[PDB]
């Protein structure tokens, strides 16, 4: 099987930056085809044979390369260019796509507006407690949340989900949810969540009783 | 116009048999150089090609799923079928049928279907346990974040609206998180000015139609 | 390079016995097959005669029985005896060697 | 046994994309030995066979001059035939011309052809006596002009006396290529159509010359009535291919036998599977 | 006027992994305006050296396009022709044993 | 070889 690897797993470029995705094939492929999948939609053919723009593809895109190394290039990025791009081959019939190059809009740094939410009473009476942290409107998705139960380290009881890049100001939003049992919850007080970020000078902690 | 439309079950139990169908219009699978292929996308992961059927009833499969996959066509009714026997939780994906036409250069997956999302788990359909996320009492001198927790629902399709669609300006709805119990958890969050917390009303409307459970929970500042 | 030093034409009386000539120089393999043509002023080119290396003869029906195509391998010469020239035969003649794809310079034959 | 030398000339009229494209190909038996393309890199007659690459440079100059004369005459021919048939200039039309000579076993003249076609249908041709023409409705004037120019007699001179001699020279030069007879290499292929019918195919691969006969026999008479047969396909290396397939009713394959007939077969083969 | 007859085949019987020549013998067509592409999984092969345009007794042209190719177990090769008589290009898949 | 002189139609 010809497995295709795309060198940038995630790539951030501001509108106006020349963007170059690169797809590397383990074996020589006659052609490489590129698909664009904006989230929530079916993938769209973009470069139908190694250089050729598909129908409706803007002229700013271009394909190149041959053999075991191909590339998709954006001469001048637009905001609508932000999507996932898969490199696909047909030379060997176990048709393989790339792992995807999520192309995101580069934006100036923003700091996460952290919040903490105590478990609700109607949820507490149901036998479980979930305390939810929130990171609002920060650009670099490299944020990571540390959960403090009673100043004690908690590592494996939180699930974290991130919204897609906002279409208005290209800024993310992240929430970490710590799920605990009623007995495991009522045996600690002064819960806290501390988050560090590339835009935060020092970690910011939000706490509650 | 060329149209492809997948169909099939939305939820399956493990070890069951999946039967997808792709009914297409605008082109004939009997045309020379024509084909329809099945591609699946696990959640948000990369695309995976499953099977391909030709105009002359020649079938090409993915070797990693060749024993499970079965593809067939019915060109009289313009349909293409895919059968995955003994499905597992790893078969949870959005399934696409894509047309391949050799007549003109550029027909490699030139048209795709809208995709049929399939969830394979042993859980059962359940309505969300909507909960409120009251803003903290020590309100800041800026905006405060409301929210609602949408917990323990299945399957994945759920939509949360605030004031029945009147607060779509700054609401963040986070993607569902498949918990260890097999049920999904989702949280919608809106941000509002601190000076509009107690004087203004805020309600969260969920529309979990797979369980036919409409819930409208009131959000108020924490005591 | 090859050249066809064709000559021997001129003004002849009706019923004459004119004897055209044509020879080749520069290439020593032209003797394979050579033929004669003609083109009256205002008329298209017309076949007249042809002779092979072995001496096989071919004539048009107009010149059959009154013209004579002849060759000699040793001297590279090819000739065209033209007994009984009717006044229709007033034309510029073209000796052409079939091997080289080369046309002669147009020896002129005029008959009163 | 019998040999033949043929030349095929094709002129297609590009109405607004340059002067007409001219292709001239020469064949001895089934082997193409010369070519000329007016759109090729070199406006020269190029050899397509190894045994003719040893002809002298003056030979190639003569071939190039004569093929350019053919190209020019075919351009004027397209221009004249458009007027003869009163066709619009915007139309694209093709002119095909074939002439050549055949040779018997004892290496004498046997048959002489010169045929002319316009738009893929017969226009004018030379009769077997090499002295008269067969003409179409508007080809009568072409026949009259050709008889006035006495082109029939020059054609007879070329075909009977120098076409034969050049064919003999090519045969002696290509003694190991043109005079060879590659015996067919044969296979029987069994494939299943259903549980009650199967297809039995009789292959004949890499034979020369192209003539061959494949007959299916049901332990008896020929079976050309239900046999699938393809045209002798050119293998590409100078040889030819052909296969013939029937349908066996799932178990009576031994009743079916294919008979392959070829000059290179000492005794015609009889496969049975 | 006349529609082409296509035969897609190999020079030698196909054994996977051994180099071979994929022929696409387009014959019997008229006029000569044709486009022929040899495809591997629907992708055009380069260097599709063909033959010089000739014609048969009935003035119908025949053309042979041939590439060098290596047959494999599940890769499919086809020949896509286009002609005046063909409403859409007609693709003939190469059958390994036909 | 080819024909020397071929006439126009």
């Amino acid at each position: 099987q010809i497995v295709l690897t795309q060198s940038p797993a995630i790539m951030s470029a501001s509108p106006g930056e020349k963007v170059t995705i690169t797809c590397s094939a383990s074996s020589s492929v006659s052609y490489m085809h590129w698909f664009q999948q904006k989230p929530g939609t079916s993938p769209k053919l973009w470069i139908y044979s190694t250089s050729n723009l598909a129908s409706g593809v803007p002229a700013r895109f271009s394909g190149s390369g041959s053999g075991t190394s191909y590339s998709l290039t954006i001469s001048r990025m637009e905001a609508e260019d932000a999507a996932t791009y898969y490199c696909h081959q047909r030379s060997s019939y176990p048709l393989t796509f790339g792992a995807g190059t999520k192309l995101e809009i580069k934006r100036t740094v923003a700091a996460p507006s952290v919040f903490i939410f105590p478990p609700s009473d109607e949820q507490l009476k149901s036998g479980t407690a979930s305390v939810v942290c929130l990171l609002n409107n920060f650009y670099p998705r490299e944020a990571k949340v540390q959960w403090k139960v009673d100043n004690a380290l908690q590592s494996g009881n939180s699930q974290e989900s991130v919204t897609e890049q906002d279409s208005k100001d290209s800024t993310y939003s992240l929430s970490s949810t710590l799920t605990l049992s009623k007995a495991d919850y009522e045996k600690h007080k002064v819960y806290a969540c501390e988050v560090t970020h590339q835009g935060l000078s020092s970690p910011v902690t939000k706490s509650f009783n | 116009q060329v149209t492809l439309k997948e169909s099939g079950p939305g939820i399956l139990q493990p070890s069951q048999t999946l039967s997808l169908t792709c009914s297409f219009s605008g082109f004939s699978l009997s045309t020379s150089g024509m084909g329809v292929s099945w591609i699946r996308q696990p959640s948000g992961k990369g695309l995976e090609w499953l099977a391909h059927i030709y105009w002359d009833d020649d079938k090409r499969y993915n070797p990693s799923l060749k024993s499970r996959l079965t593809i067939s066509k019915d060109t009289s009714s313009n349909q293409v079928f895919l059968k995955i026997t003994s499905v597992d939780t790893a078969d949870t994906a959005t399934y696409y049928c894509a047309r391949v036409y050799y007549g003109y250069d550029g027909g490699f997956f030139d048209y795709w279907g809208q995709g049929t999302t399939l969830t394979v788990s042993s859980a059962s359909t359940k309505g969300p346990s909507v909960f409120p996320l009251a803003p903290s009492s020590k309100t800041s001198g800026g905006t405060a974040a409301l929210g609602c927790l949408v917990k323990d629902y299945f399957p994945e399709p759920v939509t949360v609206s605030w004031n029945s669609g009147a607060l779509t300006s700054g609401v963040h709805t986070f993607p569902a998180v498949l918990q260890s119990s097999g049920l999904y958890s989702l949280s919608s969050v809106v941000t509002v000015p601190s000076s509009s917390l107690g004087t203004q009303t805020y309600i969260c409307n969920v529309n979990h139609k797979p369980s036919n459970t409409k819930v409208d929970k009131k959000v108020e500042p924490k005591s | 390079q090859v050249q066809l030093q064709e000559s021997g034409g001129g003004l002849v009386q009706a019923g004459g016995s004119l004897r055209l000539s044509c020879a080749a120089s520069g290439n020593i393999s032209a003797v394979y097959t050579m033929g004669w043509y003609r083109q009256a002023p205002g008329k298209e080119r017309e076949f007249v005669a042809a002779i092979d290396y072995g001496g096989s003869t071919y004539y048009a029906d107009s010149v059959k029985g009154r013209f004579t195509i002849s060759r000699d391998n040793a001297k590279n010469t090819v000739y065209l005896q033209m007994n009984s020239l009717k006044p229709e035969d007033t034309a510029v003649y073209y000796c052409a060697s079939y091997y080289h794809g080369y046309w002669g310079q147009g020896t002129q034959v005029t008959v009163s | 046994g019998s040999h033949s030398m043929r030349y095929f000339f094709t002129s297609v009229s590009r109405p607004g994309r340059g002067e007409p494209r001219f292709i001239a190909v020469g064949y001895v038996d089934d082997t193409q030995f010369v070519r000329f393309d007016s759109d090729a890199a070199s406006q020269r007659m190029e050899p397509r066979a190894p045994w003719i690459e040893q002809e002298g440079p003056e030979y190639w100059d003569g071939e190039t001059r004569k093929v350019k004369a053919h190209s020019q005459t075919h351009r004027v021919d397209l221009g004249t035939l458009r007027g003869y048939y009163n066709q619009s200039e915007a139309g694209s039309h093709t002119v095909q011309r074939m002439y050549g000579c055949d040779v018997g076993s004892d290496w004498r003249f046997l048959r002489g052809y010169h045929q002319y076609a316009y738009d893929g249908k017969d226009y004018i041709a030379l009769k077997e006596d090499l002295r008269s023409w067969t003409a179409a409705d508007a080809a009568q004037t072409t026949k009259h002009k050709w008889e006035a120019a006495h082109v029939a007699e020059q054609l007879r001179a070329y075909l009977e006396g120098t076409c034969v001699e050049w064919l003999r020279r090519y045969l002696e030069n290509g003694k190991e290529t043109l005079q060879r007879t590659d015996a067919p290499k044969t296979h029987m292929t069994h494939h299943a159509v259903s549980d009650h019918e199967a297809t039995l195919r009789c292959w004949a691969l890499s034979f020369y010359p192209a003539e061959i006969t494949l007959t299916w026999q049901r332990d008896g008479e020929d079976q050309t009535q239900d046999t699938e047969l393809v045209e002798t396909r050119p293998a590409g290396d100078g040889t030819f291919q052909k296969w013939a397939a029937v349908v066996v009713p799932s178990g009576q394959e031994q009743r079916y036998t294919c008979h392959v007939q070829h000059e290179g077969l000492p005794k015609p083969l009889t496969l049975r599977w | 006027q006349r529609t082409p007859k296509i035969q897609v085949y190999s020079r030698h019987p196909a054994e996977n992994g051994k180099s071979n020549f994929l022929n696409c013998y387009v014959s019997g067509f008229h006029p000569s305006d044709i486009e022929v592409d040899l495809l591997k999984n629907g992708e055009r092969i380069e260097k599709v050296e063909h033959s010089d345009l000739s014609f048969s007794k009935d003035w119908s042209f025949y053309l042979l396009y041939y590439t060098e190719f290596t047959p494999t177990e599940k890769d499919e090769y086809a020949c896509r022709v286009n002609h005046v008589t063909l409403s859409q290009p007609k693709i003939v898949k190469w059958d390994r044993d036909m | 070889s080819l024909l020397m002189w071929i006439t126009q139609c």
Side-chain angles (χ1 to χ4, degrees), chain B residues 47-111:
Chain B
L47 297 155
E48 171 169 53
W49 169 81
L50 297 176
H52 182 91
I53 194 154
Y54 276 117
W55 71 99
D56 52 39
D57 209 71
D58 207 355
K59 310 161 200 71
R60 297 269 182 274
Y61 299 112
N62 203 311
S64 64
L65 311 100
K66 209 204 293 195
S67 57
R68 302 206 293 139
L69 287 168
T70 280
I71 188 153
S72 56
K73 86 159 166 311
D74 178 27
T75 189
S76 79
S77 62
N78 285 306
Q79 268 167 317
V80 156
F81 314 105
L82 188 87
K83 191 163 319 301
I84 311 204
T85 70
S86 67
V87 294
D88 201 28
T89 53
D91 308 43
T92 316
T94 299
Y95 287 82
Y96 299 99
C97 66
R99 173 229 206 182
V100 185
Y101 187 38
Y102 298 167
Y104 308 107
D105 211 13
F108 326 110
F109 305 150
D110 44 352
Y111 299 103

Side-chain angles (χ1 to χ4, degrees), chain B residues 155-176:
Chain B
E156 204 283 297
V158 82
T159 54
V160 184
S161 302
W162 283 73
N163 293 36
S164 197
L167 303 182
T168 70
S169 54
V171 50
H172 286 295
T173 286
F174 298 95

Side-chain angles (χ1 to χ4, degrees), chain F:
Chain F
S1 34
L2 309 77
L3 195 61
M4 171 65 38
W5 163 80
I6 86 166
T7 324
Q8 313 184 350
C9 283

Side-chain angles (χ1 to χ4, degrees), chain B residues 209-220:
Chain B
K209 89 175 279 303
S211 187
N212 283 298
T213 168
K214 172 92 87 179
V215 152
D216 192 0
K217 183 148 288 280
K218 167 81 178 203
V219 175
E220 85 296 317

Side-chain angles (χ1 to χ4, degrees), chain A residues 40-198:
Chain A
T41 67
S42 50
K44 279 168 282 285
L45 186 73
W46 223 234
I47 308 302
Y48 72 62
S49 211
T50 285
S51 72
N52 297 101
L53 306 183
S55 198
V57 174
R60 80 192 77 108
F61 290 91
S62 70
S64 100
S66 197
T68 72
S69 179
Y70 297 72
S71 292
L72 177 141
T73 302
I74 314 180
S75 76
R76 159 86 43 94
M77 191 155 158
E78 198 148 295
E80 50 166 50
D81 279 54
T84 321
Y85 295 92
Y86 300 89
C87 64
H88 159 240
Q89 61 97 41
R90 288 189 63 89
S91 84
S92 191
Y93 220 99
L95 315 182
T96 49
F97 290 77
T101 291
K102 194 190 148 271
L103 204 163
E104 62 188 352
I105 314 151
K106 164 154 290 282
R107 169 209 152 71
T108 186
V109 185
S113 298
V114 202
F115 303 109
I116 188 66
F117 295 115
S120 209
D121 54 351
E122 47 174 305
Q123 162 192 178
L124 280 170
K125 67 162 53 63
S126 296
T128 322
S130 163
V131 55
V132 186
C133 164
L134 171 71
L135 279 69
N136 213 245
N137 295 119
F138 64 97
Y139 162 63
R141 205 224 68 80
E142 291 76 320
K144 74 93 181 183
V145 181
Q146 276 280 268
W147 275 102
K148 312 317 287 193
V149 284
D150 206 330
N151 307 290
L153 184 75
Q154 180 43 257
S155 54
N157 260 4
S158 62
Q159 263 174 310
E160 155 199 293
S161 68
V162 202
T163 40
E164 197 213 329
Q165 203 145 117
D166 194 354
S167 60
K168 288 160 55 187
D169 43 358
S170 157
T171 185
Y172 277 81
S173 288
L174 179 147
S175 83
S176 176
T177 278
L178 202 90
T179 311
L180 295 167
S181 304
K182 192 53 171 323
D184 207 322
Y185 170 61
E186 301 275 21
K187 76 191 312 293
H188 292 47
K189 297 302 152 189
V190 67
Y191 290 87
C193 56
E194 65 185 57
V195 314
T196 178
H197 195 234
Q198 177 278 349

